[PDB]
PDB file of C-alpha atoms in Angstrom:
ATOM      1  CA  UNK A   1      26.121   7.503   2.511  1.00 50.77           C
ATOM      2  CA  UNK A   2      29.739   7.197   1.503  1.00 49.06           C
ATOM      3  CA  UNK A   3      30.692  11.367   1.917  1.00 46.60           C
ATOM      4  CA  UNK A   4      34.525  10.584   2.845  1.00 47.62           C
ATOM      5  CA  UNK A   5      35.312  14.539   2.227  1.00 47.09           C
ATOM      6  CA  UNK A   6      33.361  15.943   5.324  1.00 48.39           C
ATOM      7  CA  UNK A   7      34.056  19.486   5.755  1.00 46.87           C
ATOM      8  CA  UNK A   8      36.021  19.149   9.092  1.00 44.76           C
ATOM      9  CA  UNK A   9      39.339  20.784   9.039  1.00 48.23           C
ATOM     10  CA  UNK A  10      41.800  21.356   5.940  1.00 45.32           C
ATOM     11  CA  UNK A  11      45.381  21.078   6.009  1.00 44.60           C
ATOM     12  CA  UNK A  12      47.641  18.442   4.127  1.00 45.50           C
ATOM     13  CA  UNK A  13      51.256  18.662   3.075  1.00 46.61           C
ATOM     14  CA  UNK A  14      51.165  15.801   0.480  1.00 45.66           C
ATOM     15  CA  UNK A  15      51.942  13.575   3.097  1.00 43.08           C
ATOM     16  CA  UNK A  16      52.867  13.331   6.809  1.00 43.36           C
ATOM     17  CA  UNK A  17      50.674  10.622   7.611  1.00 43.14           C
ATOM     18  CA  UNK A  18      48.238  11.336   5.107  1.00 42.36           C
ATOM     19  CA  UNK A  19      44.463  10.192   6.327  1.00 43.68           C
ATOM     20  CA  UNK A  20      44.343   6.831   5.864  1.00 41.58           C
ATOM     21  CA  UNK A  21      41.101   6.411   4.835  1.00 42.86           C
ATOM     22  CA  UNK A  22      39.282   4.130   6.873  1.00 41.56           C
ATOM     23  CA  UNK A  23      37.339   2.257   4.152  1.00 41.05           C
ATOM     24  CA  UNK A  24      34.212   4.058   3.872  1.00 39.88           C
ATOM     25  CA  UNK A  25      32.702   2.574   1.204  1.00 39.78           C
ATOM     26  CA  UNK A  26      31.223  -0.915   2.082  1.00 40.63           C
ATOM     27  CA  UNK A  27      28.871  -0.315   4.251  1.00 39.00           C
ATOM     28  CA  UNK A  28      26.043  -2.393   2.050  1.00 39.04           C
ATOM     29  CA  UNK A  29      22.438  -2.868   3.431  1.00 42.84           C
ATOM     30  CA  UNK A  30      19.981  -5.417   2.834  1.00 44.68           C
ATOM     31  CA  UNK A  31      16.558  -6.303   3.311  1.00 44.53           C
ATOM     32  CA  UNK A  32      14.187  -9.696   2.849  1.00 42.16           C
ATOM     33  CA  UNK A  33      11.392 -10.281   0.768  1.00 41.42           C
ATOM     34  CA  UNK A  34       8.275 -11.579   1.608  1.00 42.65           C
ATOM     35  CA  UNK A  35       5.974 -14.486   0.068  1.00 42.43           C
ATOM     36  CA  UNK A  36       2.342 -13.651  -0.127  1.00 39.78           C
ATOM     37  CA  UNK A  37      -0.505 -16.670  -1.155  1.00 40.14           C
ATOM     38  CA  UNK A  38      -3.969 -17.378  -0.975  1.00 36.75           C
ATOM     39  CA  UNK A  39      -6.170 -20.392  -2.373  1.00 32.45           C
ATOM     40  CA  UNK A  40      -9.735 -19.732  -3.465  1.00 33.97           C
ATOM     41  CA  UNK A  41     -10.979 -23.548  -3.288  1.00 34.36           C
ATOM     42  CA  UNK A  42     -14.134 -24.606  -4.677  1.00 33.24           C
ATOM     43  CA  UNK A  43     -15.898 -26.633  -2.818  1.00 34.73           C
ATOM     44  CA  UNK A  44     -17.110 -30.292  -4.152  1.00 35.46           C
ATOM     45  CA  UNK A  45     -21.143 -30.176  -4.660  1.00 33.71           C
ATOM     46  CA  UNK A  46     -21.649 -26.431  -4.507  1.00 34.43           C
ATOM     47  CA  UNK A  47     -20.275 -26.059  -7.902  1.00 32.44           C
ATOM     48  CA  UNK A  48     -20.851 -25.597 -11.621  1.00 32.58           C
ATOM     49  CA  UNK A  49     -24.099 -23.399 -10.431  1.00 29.22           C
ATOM     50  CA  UNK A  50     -25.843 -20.297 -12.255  1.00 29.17           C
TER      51      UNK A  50
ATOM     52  CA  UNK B   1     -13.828 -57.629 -24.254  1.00 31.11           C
ATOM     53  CA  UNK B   2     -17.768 -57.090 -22.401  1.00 31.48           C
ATOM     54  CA  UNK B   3     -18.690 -53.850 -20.836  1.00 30.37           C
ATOM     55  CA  UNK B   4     -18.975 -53.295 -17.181  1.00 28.32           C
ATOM     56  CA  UNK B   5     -21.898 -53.961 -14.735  1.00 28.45           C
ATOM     57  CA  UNK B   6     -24.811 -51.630 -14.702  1.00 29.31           C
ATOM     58  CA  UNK B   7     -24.366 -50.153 -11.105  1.00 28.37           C
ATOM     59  CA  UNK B   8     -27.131 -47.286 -11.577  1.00 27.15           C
ATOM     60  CA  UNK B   9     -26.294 -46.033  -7.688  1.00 24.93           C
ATOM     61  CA  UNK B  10     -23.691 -43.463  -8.911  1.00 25.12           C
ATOM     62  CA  UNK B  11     -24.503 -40.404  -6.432  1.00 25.38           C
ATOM     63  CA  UNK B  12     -21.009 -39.810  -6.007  1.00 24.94           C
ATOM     64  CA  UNK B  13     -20.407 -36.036  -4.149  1.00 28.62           C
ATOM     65  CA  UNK B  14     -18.958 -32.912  -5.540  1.00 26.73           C
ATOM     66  CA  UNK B  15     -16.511 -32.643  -2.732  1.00 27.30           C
ATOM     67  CA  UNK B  16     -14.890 -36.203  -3.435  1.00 26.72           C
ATOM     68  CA  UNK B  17     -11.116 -36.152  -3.990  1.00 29.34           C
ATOM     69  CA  UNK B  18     -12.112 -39.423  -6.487  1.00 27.14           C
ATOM     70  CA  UNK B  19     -12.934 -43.237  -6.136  1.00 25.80           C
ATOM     71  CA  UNK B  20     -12.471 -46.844  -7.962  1.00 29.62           C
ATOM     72  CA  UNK B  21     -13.457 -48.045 -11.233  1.00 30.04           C
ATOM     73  CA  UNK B  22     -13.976 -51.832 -12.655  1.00 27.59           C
ATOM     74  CA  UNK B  23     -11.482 -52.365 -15.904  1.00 30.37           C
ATOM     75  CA  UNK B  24     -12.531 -55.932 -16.769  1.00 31.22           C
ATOM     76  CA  UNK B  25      -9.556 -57.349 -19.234  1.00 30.96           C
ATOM     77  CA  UNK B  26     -10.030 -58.688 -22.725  1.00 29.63           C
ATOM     78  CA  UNK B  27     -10.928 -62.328 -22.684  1.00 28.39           C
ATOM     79  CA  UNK B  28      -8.923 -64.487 -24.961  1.00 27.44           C
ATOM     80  CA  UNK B  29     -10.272 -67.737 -27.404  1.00 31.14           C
ATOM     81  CA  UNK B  30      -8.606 -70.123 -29.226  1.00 30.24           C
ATOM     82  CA  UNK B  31      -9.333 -72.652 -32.447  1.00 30.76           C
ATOM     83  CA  UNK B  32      -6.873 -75.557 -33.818  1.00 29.25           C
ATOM     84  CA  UNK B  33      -6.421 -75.584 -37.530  1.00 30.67           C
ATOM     85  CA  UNK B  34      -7.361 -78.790 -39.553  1.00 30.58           C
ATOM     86  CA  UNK B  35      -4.945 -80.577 -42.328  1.00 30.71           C
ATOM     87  CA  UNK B  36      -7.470 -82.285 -45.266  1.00 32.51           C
ATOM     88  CA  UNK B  37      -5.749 -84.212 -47.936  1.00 34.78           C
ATOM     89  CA  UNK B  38      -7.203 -85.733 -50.810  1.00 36.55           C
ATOM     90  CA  UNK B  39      -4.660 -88.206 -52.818  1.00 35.86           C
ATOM     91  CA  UNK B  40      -5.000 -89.356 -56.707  1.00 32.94           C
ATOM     92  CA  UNK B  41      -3.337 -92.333 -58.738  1.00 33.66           C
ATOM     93  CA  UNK B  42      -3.935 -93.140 -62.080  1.00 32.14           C
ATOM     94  CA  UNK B  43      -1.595 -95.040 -64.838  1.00 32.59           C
ATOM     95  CA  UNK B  44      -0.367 -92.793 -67.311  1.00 33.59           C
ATOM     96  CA  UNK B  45      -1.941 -95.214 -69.846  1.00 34.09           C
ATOM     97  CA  UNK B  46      -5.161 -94.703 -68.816  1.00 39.87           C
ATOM     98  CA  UNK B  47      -4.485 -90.816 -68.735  1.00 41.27           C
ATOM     99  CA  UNK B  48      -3.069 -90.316 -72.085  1.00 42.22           C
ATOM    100  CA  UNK B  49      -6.070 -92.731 -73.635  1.00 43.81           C
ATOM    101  CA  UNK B  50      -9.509 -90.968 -74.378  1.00 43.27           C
TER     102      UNK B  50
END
C-alpha cells in the first residue's frame, strides 16, 4: 500500500517547493509464528500388545 | 570372570524408566616361574677316548 500518486489535485511547475515526498514506502508489517507439539507416550506395561 | 547370581524375581514393570545391574570384574591369578639347571664336567681325555 505504497500508491504515492493519489489522484488529488495536479499542478507542478518543475519546482516551487516540489512535494517532498514524505517517505511512503517503509511502512513494513510483520507477524509471529506459532509452535505447535504433541507427545503420543506409550505407556510402560500396556505395550507390545496384539 | 564368573557369571552373575541367579536372581529369578525379575518382574520388573513396563512403565519403569530403568534400574541397576551387577557387573562383577574379572578376577586376576598369578604363578612364579621356576629356573632348573642341570651342570656336566668331563675331561676331554675321557671324551675324545671310546
Amino acid at each position: 500500500d505504497a500508491l504515492a500518486s493519489v489522484d488529488g489535485n495536479n499542478a507542478h511547475v518543475e519546482g516551487s517547493r516540489a512535494e517532498d515526498g514524505e517517505m511512503k514506502p517503509t511502512v513494513i508489517k510483520s507477524n509471529v509464528t506459532q509452535i505447535l507439539r504433541k507427545v503420543v507416550r506409550v505407556s510402560d506395561t500396556a505395550n507390545t500388545t496384539a
